[PDB]
Amino acid sequence: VCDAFSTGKFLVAYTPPGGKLPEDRKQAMLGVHIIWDLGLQSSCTIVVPWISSGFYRRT
Amino acid sequence: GAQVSSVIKYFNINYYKDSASSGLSRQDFSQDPSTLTNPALMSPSVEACGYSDRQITIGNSTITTSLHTVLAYGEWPTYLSDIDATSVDKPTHPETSADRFYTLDSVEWQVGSHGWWWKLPDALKDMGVFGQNMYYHSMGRSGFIIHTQCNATKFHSGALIVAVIPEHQLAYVGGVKVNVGYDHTHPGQSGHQIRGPSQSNDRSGGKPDEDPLFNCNGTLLGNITIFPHQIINLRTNNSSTIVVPYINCVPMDNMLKHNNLSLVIIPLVPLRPGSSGINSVPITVTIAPYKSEFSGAMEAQRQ
Amino acid sequence: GAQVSSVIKYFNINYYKDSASSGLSRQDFSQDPSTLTNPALMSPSVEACGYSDRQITIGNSTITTSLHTVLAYGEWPTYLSDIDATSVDKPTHPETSADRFYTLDSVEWQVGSHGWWWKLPDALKDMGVFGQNMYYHSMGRSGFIIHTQCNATKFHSGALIVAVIPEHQLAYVGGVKVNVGYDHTHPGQSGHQIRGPSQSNDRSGGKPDEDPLFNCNGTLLGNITIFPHQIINLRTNNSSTIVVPYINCVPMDNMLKHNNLSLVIIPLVPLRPGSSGINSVPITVTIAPYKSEFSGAMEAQRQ
């Protein structure tokens, strides 16, 4: 939520099970990621994939 | 009720309407009637199914020996395929670069040497581009080919047991309730020399059990033959080969945390030199990842 | 003699019996007769051949932008196949684990910033399991997808030239006869900020030329459009995408020694803030190895 004149590029990164929280962008980009760009709003949604050993994950 | 979709018929009925509410499971027949051995156990000869898949060469490295290969659980290694897999994400197949024979540090086999063990995939974690794909991926599965080779002369004597134990869970070295440490059960390629048993063995930091007779887990040797194994008798053969598929409940596991195999080598009968003066002989182990798959790529899990 | 197997016929004759002893090469015809443009140059639109190969996603990473992608030399990247290859040894294809978008360190674009360049594959040498496969393999080939993205507002101004130069051979920073150092032409992911020209620029250890007008190699800007390129004009577009095949004489080269591409980004017109108070904007580069192949596995060439 901003004005129409603002613009931005965001990196949305999902680090799979077993990985540390990245602490810097070069370690975040190596997982699942999407580049969310304003002025599209087709790029907003990241789909967290199902990556797991077992078939189910405990709530 | 429900049902479902010297010889006694019975009407199949679920009184409670459900599966798993049903009673114990028998062997059905549609019409009247009117098994003794399991070749999957007993460690077949890898010709006892088919030899077309095998002179043994995986991925740029050659073994020349293959009727005496034991095929663990009579199942040939294969990729996860589909329909048995959890994630739809396409795994990575390194193939010939990460599927190749990795020879480890040789170990002197002496008089009084109690045994050795290596955990897998762990032993390979620093080896080549297989050991790189472990860290950069969430999960993975691999079958292995273990080639154990110990050569002495016709004057020497003594036998080894080369066994592959799925999920070999070590016992703590004694006393109180402690989990063996992450570091002592992940030794790397050097494996673990079994130095016990003794009452003087150190107890700290969760060190594993040093007793070879109880398999370090509390179950006798000589029953270790229920696993895939070969017996290297220096009167007969100098080497060993074992082809293990991927054994686990899960399609893919971490490979850093979970070691789904163990390579155990026990001097069943000691090494006696003959008229020769050689008191010790090297044992060499060569492991080949085979049909390995990796998925869930990330930053290297390396610390 | 030999021959071989306004309109003038001629009897094709090798007087010396050989090819390459023959004279200059014309365009033959079998019967009587009775071209202006090369779309491979001019950097096509990647729809100008076909768009079925492309929302841009390689190997677990997504780009959402693809009619404005330029397809370098009108050729789509593809594996070495056969018959063009030297070794028969089967290359390794890492696919989605090592073929993915790697975003590099962003660079402030300021007033007075002369330019930037990155050498490829070099920029990716520490990136993921692509940068691992470089060291563990003798040779390799890869196509790349360069996505350059710089966003400012409607108040800002200024243009960039994003060009990909095959075999961009840097000039030494001046004077005597020196080869630029291995280290200065292999900067890593950080690339090289062009800080010149000046008479005061340091000359030591083979440092590369700092002059952006002469392309650091001695050839003008504005002729840099003969390479695959895009012009990012902050009045029009914020981003760029370029798809390069594998350009080289050899099927596979080392990738540590030989950098077969360069990504050059030149502020053709400076960055002027408008009524806004923002004096600098980040430029971000995202490189995807595509259709990469590795062969000749060895110990890591890493020092």
UniProtKB/Swiss-Prot annotation, chain A:
It comes from the Viruses. It is found in: Virion; Host cytoplasm. Forms an icosahedral capsid of pseudo T=3 symmetry with capsid proteins VP2 and VP3. The capsid is 300 Angstroms in diameter, composed of 60 copies of each capsid protein and enclosing the viral positive strand RNA genome. Interacts with capsid protein VP0 and capsid protein VP1 to form heterotrimeric protomers. Five protomers subsequently associate to form pentamers which serve as building blocks for the capsid. Interacts with capsid protein VP4 in the mature capsid. Interacts with protein 2C; this interaction may be important for virion morphogenesis. Interacts with host CDHR3 (via N-terminus); this interaction occurs near each threefold vertex of the capsid and allows the virus attachment and entry into the host cell. This is Capsid protein VP3. It comes from Human rhinovirus C (strain C15).
